[PDB]
Each structure stands twice: as structure tokens, then as C-alpha cells.
Symmetry: D2
Subunit: 250 residues, 4 copies
């Protein structure tokens, strides 16, 4: 019978492309979402049309708070309830906005940016590992530019840095259970509607390999590799999918 | 006129040695503490005996909470009330204990470990810089040389230190326009717990290529002094390992 | 037409497994060898028995010398000669032995360790690029996961693998405009040879968090295959560890 | 008795600044040079004028060849001959020029010069330095490059050389730690620019640096060297200190 995967922030964009490829590969998927309820439901419908009873949605705010552990336990619980198993966790959900050092409160920004990008991944990893009853693995969506951070994005960058540490820490600690933990680190990918042709072009032009952004599917391809039987000896690795962007000096 | 430094968790061990060396170098010091009031005050008294009116203490919990930003603002404000200036911020205070993946709730652990190691440093950096909006202004973060060879069951602590690395780098870039340098010192094995069995202390000591011993607090403090000095005025965004080669040792 | 690949040091062990997988995926292949001519030829016989005229062999010493550039050009030429195209280059050939700091001369060791691990890959890279719509051109360098926790007495080997990292990154940048991707695969402990003592083999195996075993040659090859595939077409400058977590383990 | 130091490529620019600062701290110095004989002799003159019998010059090509090991052994031997000891080695000499991957010197000469100076000579010097040893504070400092993981276009061999030197720094730190010899590095970003560089190209480099939009002075680089050799760095080994004013942290 078919393995099962949770993908956080899977309603749209990169998380959706990850959910789609996992499903094409034969996974049953939990499509987690926060605000994008319509897109989530529509994706589950599309996927269930392809193979019945292979997709469910699961709503949760991944902002840090005293109930985040419960929410994260519930996401994993929702995979077992629907599919009787949980083979793969993809930590993709992520808040992203500037927090300059010099109308959300600063503690709300901390809770959002650090919760989504780091604490929730940690709690989800905890619950995933504890619920284990095979090719089990976790893939974290990191950031190829983590050591060349954008100006005024401190809290975001801190979250992505903690996510690197979690990836390495959990790889080590979960290895005795046969659970692999790895990361995929995009550079410029699927820039959204709808920043100017200006700023999109400015970022696309930085990319040595083709002067273009990654497609969502290109990011998903690397996730697919890491969860596959072709990556069974791979744990604690973070694969840049950045067309060489992080190698480019000032 | 004499520059001033805030050192967090400065009552004991490594932070104390940092505050002593800064004081010996000519700084006035805010000795921040959480639970260690008696040692904090004892340090302040010793330093004030050396030079009157050069050391004050400041108490705060640096666990993450709704009140942390105001607590951090108060710490910076306190250096300005005492000394009229704040030249140097040393983020040293840190909670440290295991949080295995498989008394305290996990969200408390998050609050303490990510609060002390990362969020408090960030809020302190904001407040420090906001107050600055021949001066040699800088921040030094106490990191961890073993951050990419993490210890078993220390994921939250490790996550905290990794975030601290990101902060060190992001703030270096963002504050460079104000002449504020931001750097780190990354100990390997330094001061071991008093209560740790000497036999267990020795398993750690034996891992260190250089001398098969832990770093003194003073050796950690030496790197901090360098980073804040006029000899490091082009250095920002750098994290100096002070680890006796430990991080280079394979399994 | 079927794409073609050059694999250096392909007669045995990891290079053989890479050659076989590329061939299984539909590539024609040049099996480069230095001393292992019998094994290179049995490999080509096997592969050509599956699909005719799809494997050839090519001999060369990859030690640095006055003739190395010409040898490297000839390797790439052998692929164009045999197959009309060269889509993939896998730099796998590598000399490996200790060079303590305190009967080959030291300069012969420099030539072999740095030649095979760094200089020949640079020259092969030059010749590969010089010879070049819907193509998928890439280079994969066999690096080393333990490059920043190097083994005692292996400075020149380690220097060579460090230089290969540099090449991987420099070449990814410089060849990107040509559509040529350049990536690395970094084993930890893989296919420990028959020669080595079993207690020393067991020591290395026991260090590996994921299964306390070495990687098979096929496991290393899987990562190579991924990197040369259409599934990695936005990936350049990346080095993928295939090490079962070994590099993450502290002293 | 005063300690002694070898500084490679020390006749001018950063290497000079290092030798001068070491000398001011109380070291006797061997000023190595290759082609800049006049500048080297002029430096030794000044230092000797400050304290008699405290500087000597030593000529050597550090291009890789089968006699490079002898040449490096002789550099260390010259420090012992002049001063009776050798406490500090600074590996500063370096060839630097592009070597484009797609199309003067043959490529094998370019390999020998770029990889020789930046990596192999440091290795051989380190071997000889350790081999010649018996409150000592023995150390090696390697001049690295903060941009090593964001390399400049068409500088493959140079970058390979600097990467190899990182590996040496790390490997030698571990292997020489038992002898009390620390090995560390200093990694400039943009420091002293070429005389001939057009001030427009110079300003393009300057404007990249977050801390001050200016290049590091030679003294700023030397300051980090001096820290690493001092008693204030006695637990530090295997460490590479960027002196780059934030440049390596700046994205494309
Ligand atoms: N795009 C890039 O160029 C790029 C570059 C580097 C790294 N990455 C990383 O790659 C991953 C995917 O990137 P992306 O651009 O597709 O991400 P994105 O669109 O910015 O966000 C992905 C999803 O995260 C979810 N999310 C945000 N805040 C949340 C919260 N408080 N609780 C729960 N979920 C929340 C949202 O769900 P709802 O829509 O359901 O609210 C959102 O759709 C991210 O981890 C990102 O940081 C992307
Ligand atoms: N010792 C080592 O081997 C080692 C190794 C690697 C890195 N480091 C780093 O170097 C630094 C110094 O190490 P250390 O061993 O001296 O540190 P430590 O003794 O564990 O902690 C230093 C101080 O942190 C303060 N602290 C802890 N929790 C706090 C909270 N919730 N709010 C406010 N302050 C709090 C405490 O102050 P009170 O006592 O006043 O409560 C404590 O004395 C730390 O950042 C540490 O992570 C140390
Ligand atoms: N095995 C591991 O645990 C491990 C760990 C980390 C990294 N790696 C890397 O992964 C790659 C494959 O490892 P491996 O253990 O399979 O390699 P290996 O057996 O040591 O050597 C591979 C081949 O390299 C060729 N070679 C050696 N010296 C040469 C020279 N002077 N000129 C031309 N060719 C020469 C040999 O070809 P002939 O037999 O034809 O002479 C040899 O069969 C290497 O790059 C290695 O550094 C391996
Ligand atoms: N300048 C920068 O912005 C910068 C940036 C990053 C890193 N660095 C590093 O910092 C160090 C000093 O930089 P720099 O600009 O002062 O260096 P440099 O002037 O390019 O070179 C220093 C010396 O190296 C010696 N040298 C060159 N080729 C040689 C050979 N074949 N044999 C022996 N010696 C040779 C030369 O000695 P003679 O003049 O006597 O012939 C030269 O004076 C270098 O290791 C460099 O890579 C500098
Ligand atoms: N969560 C998230 N979204 C991102 N987006 C969506 C908002 S606009 C630009 C791409 C990026 C980009 C780099 N890291 C990111 N992380
Ligand atoms: N990897 C990445 N890309 C970024 N870009 C390009 C993708 S879309 C928005 C700006 C930013 C911005 C802040 N941190 C970032 N990290
Ligand atoms: N640098 C470092 N040292 C550690 N040691 C040695 C010092 S005292 C306690 C254990 C630990 C433990 C978890 N993370 C650590 N990081
Ligand atoms: N905050 C903190 N405390 C530490 N302690 C606890 C008090 S005494 C033994 C060291 C260590 C050790 C490595 N990283 C650490 N971080
Ligand atoms: N070229 C090469 N061969 C290796 N071999 C063959 C000889 S014995 C150990 C496996 C190893 C091992 C780590 N890096 C290596 N590189
Ligand atoms: N990755 C790796 N493995 C090594 N091992 C384990 C494989 S077989 C021989 C020792 C060594 C030895 C020196 N450099 C090495 N690098
Ligand atoms: N040996 C060396 N020389 C350099 N010089 C002197 C010649 S022209 C360019 C500046 C630079 C510059 C960056 N890394 C360098 N390494
Ligand atoms: N650190 C650094 N600076 C560079 N610059 C700035 C200083 S002067 C010459 C160009 C170059 C050039 C090639 N590799 C370099 N590395």
C-alpha cells in the first residue's frame, strides 16, 4: 500500500508543486494550509480526482504560541487519521517580510517569522518521530542565501538559520530510527504577482544559470530526490537549487 | 571619557571574565544577571573598588515573552542612565539543557532556549542601535564552535545558536552604515559545569587537539577584547572560533 | 542521439558504479583508467554486450606534469571521437595516501595528490568546456564530506579536495553562461577496500549515524545520476553529501 | 631573547605591514622577497636602523618545482642562521592573475605559480618550520581570501590555491597541535588595490564594502595577524578570521 506525506503551506506555489509531485510519485498527501482554504480544497479535489481517497486538507496557524505544539501534533495526527501512516514530512510553510533593526508588534513578528520557519518545523519533527509505529524522511525548505542575507530581514534569516541547525540536529538524533532529515535551499524561485518587472528583473538578472528564477517544479524535483530510494544514505544534507546565485560576489 | 559596555549573563564564568577584561581595558560596565544577584553585586563592588562609579548591575529574565522587548530596552537604557553612553553590547547570557525529539513544557523550553540565545540578542541589538540613531561601537555574540557538529538531544539550543549566527551576519550588514560592527566569539569546550564528574570533564578535555584542555574564561574574553578594540575596526560579520581545534576533529 | 559521458578512474569501485548507472540511464561512456586496464576492458565488454559500441576505454596518468594538459585534452577528444559529443564529465579518479608534516619524494606526492584531485579536473574542465538548445551539459566532481574535519597526516590529499571544492564553485560560475552545470558529490565512508584491517574498517563504519555502515558504490552513483539528470537542471555549484550524517558527528 | 618571524612576500604592501608590525612588537624578522630586492633591502635597512641586527632579507621563488622543498627549507634555515630560532611563520606571498577556463604563460607554469605560491610553498614551509623546532609561542598564519566561496570570474587556479590553503590551515592545525604549534589564517576581502587599477575600477570594488565603502589598509590586515600570533590567541588554532568589512556577506 501507498506511503503518506505531509506538506506544510501546500495550497499554493512551491508547496503545491511539492504535493503534486509527491502524489504523482504515489504518495497520499496531507495538504496543510493557513489562509488559502479555497486553493487547498481545490488541490485536494484535483488530486482525489486522479486517485480516490489520496489527499486531505489540514488547516493550521504555525505562528509560535503556547498551542503550536498541539497544532503541530494535530497536523501529524491528521495524516495517521486519513492514511494510517506518515512517511514523509516537508516543512515548507514560511512567513517572509522585513523587520528592520532601526503595524505588527515586534513579538508578533518574532512569533510568525521564527515560528513558521523554525519552531513549527521542530515541533512537527518531534510529533512525526514520536508517532512512528519503509523510507521515512523529512525535507526542510531552507534558503540558499542564508549566509548572504537581505537587508532588514534579520528575523527571517534567523529563522532560516535555525532551520539549518534543526536539519543537522534532527538528522543526527533521528538516524537511529532510520528517519533521514535533509533540506532543499532555493535561491530565486517563482516570484509572485506582482512586484514590478523592475524588482523581479533585478533578482532574475543575478542568476548565473540562465538569468531566471527556479520554477516550483524544479524546487520539487530536489525534494522528490531526497525522499526517494536513490537518497537512502543521504541525511543532514542541504541541496541548493539556486542556479549558482549564492556563489555570486557583491 | 570612558566607553561603556553591556555584558549579559555577566555574574559568573565566561560573562564575568568578559566584564572584568572590559573593565581592565577602561570600560564602564553594566553587569546584567538573571538569578545570580549575589555574584553580580560582588563583581560590581570589586570593580567599583578598582575605580569608583564604573560598574552597575541590571536584572532581567531574557526568556522570550510579551515583555522581552521592554526588558531589553531597559537593559540598554540602563547603560545610558549610568554612563551617558553605550559603546559595546556583549550577548553572552544563554540557557542550555537537552530537549530530546523522542517539569518544563516544550513551549517554555522554546521560550528559554530561543529567547536567551537568539531573540534577546536581536531585541538588544535593536535597542542598542536605536540609541545610536573616534567612537568604536560594536556588538559581540557568544556563539558555539560546535554548531555544525551538534550534540545529541540539543536541537533547540543548537537552533538558538544557529539563529545567533544569522543575527550576527544580518546585523553586521544592516548596522555597518552606522559604524556598528557585529561579530562573534565561538567557544568549543570552555568552562565545564562544577558539578560535572571530573571523569566526564576529562572525556571533553581529551577531545581538544591543542593541550587536551578546555579554554579558560579569560581566553574567551581575550577574543572579545580583540573584537571590540581599535585593532579590529575593519572586522564585521566575523565569528572567531576559540576552540583549540575541536571543531576540526572528525568522529 | 544518446548523450555521452566521461568518467575518470572508472575501472573499479565508485567510478565503475557511476559508469554502469550512466550506461543504464542511456549514456554512452568513456571508461578512463590508469593502471586498471583489464578491469576497464571487462567493464566495456559488459556494457557493449548490453548495447553495442556504447563503451570505450581511455588510458591516462592524471599526475601533474608537463604532459597532463595534453593527456586531459585527449580524454575529452576520445569522447568526441567515439561518440560525436561529450555531455557529461565525472571527475572521480583520485590518489589517496598520507603525507605527514613531520619512497616517493614530497614533490611526486604533490604531483599525484594535487594532480589527480584538483589539477586534472581543472584541465578536463577546460577541455570539456572548450569543445562545446535542449542539451543538458554538466560536470560532477567527486569531493569528500570530511573536507573540514580532515584526517591526521593527510594534508596534501585534503588540500587537493579543498581545491576541487574551489574548482566546482569557480567553474559553476564561469561556465553557467554556456549552459554547463558544475556540481559535486561528497562521500563520507564508502566501499572500504579489502586491504584495510577489519578493526579499522569497523571503527570507520561505527562512526556513521545512519545504519553504522559505509555507502555502497551504487549509493554514491545515485547522487551523480541525480545531478546529471533533468531533475537537477537548475542546480549548479552544489555539493551533495552522501555520508549518512558522518560529517555532523563531533569528536 | 627576542622571538623571530619569517614573513613571505614581505618587501611591500600587506607583507611589509605585517613584518613592520611584528618588528614593532619586538620580533626579529626575515623579509622574504622574490623580485622586489630593492624594496626588501630598503625595509630591512629601516628596521635595522630602529634595532640593530633585527632584520634580514631572503630571496626565493615560491613557484612549484622539484627544488621548491629545498627552497622552503632554506627560508626556515635562514631564520635560524640569523636569529637562532623561528617562532612565527606568515605565509603571505602569492601569485595572482586570471586563468580563464575558455580561450603568455603555459598552463603548467600558471599551475606552478598560482598553486605553488598559494598552497604548496605554504605546505613545505610549514613542514620545515615544524621539523626545525625543539614559554614558546609558536604559530603559523596563512593569508587566505574572504571571497573564496564567492569567487571572481576567470580566477579558477588562484581560487583553487586559496581553497587548498584553507585545507592546509585546518589540516596543519590538527597535526601540529601536539607540538604546541597553532595554525590560523587571516582572510582579507578588498584590501590594497593595484597601483595601475583605474580609480573607477577601484571605486567599484570600494562601493561593495558595507563597513565604510573602502578597502582594508595593510595595517588592518596586519592587526589580525598580530592578534593571532599573540598570547591573546593562545587557545586559537584552525581559525580563519575575515578582515573584510562585511564584503563576504553581501549578496549579488
Ligand atoms: N520563493 C523563493 O524565491 C524562495 C527563496 C528561498 C527560500 N524559499 C523557501 O521555499 C519555501 C517555499 O517558498 P514560497 O515562496 O512558495 O513560500 P510563500 O509562498 O511565501 O509561503 C508558503 C506558504 O507558507 C504558509 N504560511 C505563511 N505563514 C504561515 C503561518 N503563520 N502558518 C501557516 N502557514 C503559513 C502560507 O500558507 P497559506 O497561503 O495557506 O496562508 C503560504 O502559502 C519557503 O520555506 C521559503 O522560505 C523560497
Ligand atoms: N562553557 C562552554 O563550554 C561554552 C561552550 C560553547 C559556547 N558557550 C557559550 O558561551 C557563553 C558563556 O558560557 P557559560 O558556560 O559561561 O554560560 P552559562 O553559565 O550557561 O550561562 C551564562 C549566564 O546566562 C544567564 N542566563 C541563563 N538563562 C537566562 C535567562 N532565562 N535570562 C537571563 N539570563 C539567563 C545566567 O545568568 P544568572 O546566573 O544570573 O541566572 C548564566 O549565568 C554562552 O553564550 C554559551 O552558550 C559556552
Ligand atoms: N571510498 C571512500 O570512502 C571515499 C570517501 C570520500 C571521498 N571519496 C572520493 O570518491 C571518489 C572515488 O573513491 P574510490 O575509493 O572509488 O577511489 P579510489 O579507488 O582510491 O581510486 C579511484 C581510481 O582513481 C584512479 N587513479 C588513482 N591515481 C591515479 C593517477 N595517478 N592517474 C589516473 N588515475 C588515478 C585509479 O585508477 P586505476 O585503478 O585505473 O589506476 C583508481 O582506480 C574519489 O574521488 C575519492 O576521493 C571516496
Ligand atoms: N590585496 C587584496 O585585496 C587581497 C585580497 C584578498 C586576499 N589577499 C591576500 O593577502 C596576501 C597579501 O596580498 P597583497 O595584495 O599584498 O599580495 P601581492 O602584492 O600580490 O603579493 C605579495 C608578494 O607575493 C610575492 N610573490 C608573488 N609571486 C611569487 C613567487 N613566484 N615566488 C615568491 N614570491 C612571490 C611577491 O614578492 P616580490 O614582490 O618580492 O616578487 C609579492 O610582493 C596575499 O596572500 C593575498 O592573496 C589580498
Ligand atoms: N516564505 C518565503 N517566501 C518567499 N517569497 C514569497 C514572497 S515574495 C518573494 C518570494 C521567499 C523568498 C525568499 N525566501 C522566501 N520565503
Ligand atoms: N533567497 C532569498 N531571496 C530573496 N529575494 C529574491 C526572491 S523574492 C524576494 C527577494 C530575498 C529577499 C529577502 N531575503 C531573501 N532571500
Ligand atoms: N560547545 C559545546 N560543548 C558542549 N559540551 C562541552 C562543554 S560543557 C557541556 C557539554 C555541548 C553540549 C551540548 N552542546 C554543546 N556545545
Ligand atoms: N549557556 C550555555 N551554558 C553552558 N554550560 C552550562 C553552565 S556550566 C557548563 C557549560 C554551555 C556549554 C556549552 N554551551 C553552553 N551554553
Ligand atoms: N581516492 C580516494 N580513495 C579512497 N579509498 C581508496 C583507498 S583506502 C580508502 C578508500 C578514499 C577514502 C577517502 N577518500 C578517498 N579517496
Ligand atoms: N572521507 C574520508 N574518509 C577517510 N577514511 C574512511 C574511508 S577509508 C580510509 C579513512 C579518510 C581518511 C583520510 N581522509 C579521509 N576522508
Ligand atoms: N596575491 C594577491 N594579490 C592581490 N593583488 C595584488 C596584485 S593585483 C590585485 C591585488 C590580490 C587581490 C586579491 N587577492 C589577491 N592576492
Ligand atoms: N578578495 C578578492 N579581491 C579581488 N579584487 C579586489 C581586490 S584588487 C583585485 C580584485 C579579487 C579578484 C579576484 N579574486 C579576488 N579576491
Amino acid at each position: 500500500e501507498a506511503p503518506a506525506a505531509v506538506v506544510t503551506g501546500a495550497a499554493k506555489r512551491i508547496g503545491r508543486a511539492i504535493a503534486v509531485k509527491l502524489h504523482q510519485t504515489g504518495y497520499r498527501v496531507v495538504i496543510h494550509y493557513h489562509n488559502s482554504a479555497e486553493a487547498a480544497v481545490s488541490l485536494a479535489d484535483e488530486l482525489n480526482k486522479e486517485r480516490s481517497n489520496t489527499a486531505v486538507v489540514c488547516q493550521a496557524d504555525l505562528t509560535n504560541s503556547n498551542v503550536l505544539p498541539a497544532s503541530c501534533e494535530e497536523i501529524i495526527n491528521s495524516c495517521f487519521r486519513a492514511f494510517g501512516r506518515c512517511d514523509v514530512l516537508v516543512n515548507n510553510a514560511s512567513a517572509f517580510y522585513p523587520t528592520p533593526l532601526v503595524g505588527k508588534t515586534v513579538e508578533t513578528q518574532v512569533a510568525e517569522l521564527i515560528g513558521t520557519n523554525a519552531i513549527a518545523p521542530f515541533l512537527l519533527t518531534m510529533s512525526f518521530a514520536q508517532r512512528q509505529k519503509s523510507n521515512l524522511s523529512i525535507v526542510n525548505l531552507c534558503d540558499a542565501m542564508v549566509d548572504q542575507p537581505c537587508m532588514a530581514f534579520s528575523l527571517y534569516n534567523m529563522g532560516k538559520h535555525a532551520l539549518v541547525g534543526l536539519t543537522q540536529s534532527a538528522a543526527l538524533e533521528l538516524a537511529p530510527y532510520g528517519i533521514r532529515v535533509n533540506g532543499v535551499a532555493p535561491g530565486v524561485s517563482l516570484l509572485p504577482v506582482a512586484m514590478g518587472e523592475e524588482e523581479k528583473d533585478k533578482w532574475r538578472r543575478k542568476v548565473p544559470l540562465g538569468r531566471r528564477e527556479a520554477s516550483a517544479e524544479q524546487i520539487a524535483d530536489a525534494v522528490i530526490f531526497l525522499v526517494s530510494g536513490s537518497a537512502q544514505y543521504i541525511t543532514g544534507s542541504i541541496i541548493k537549487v539556486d542556479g549558482g546565485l549564492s556563489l555570486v560576489h557583491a
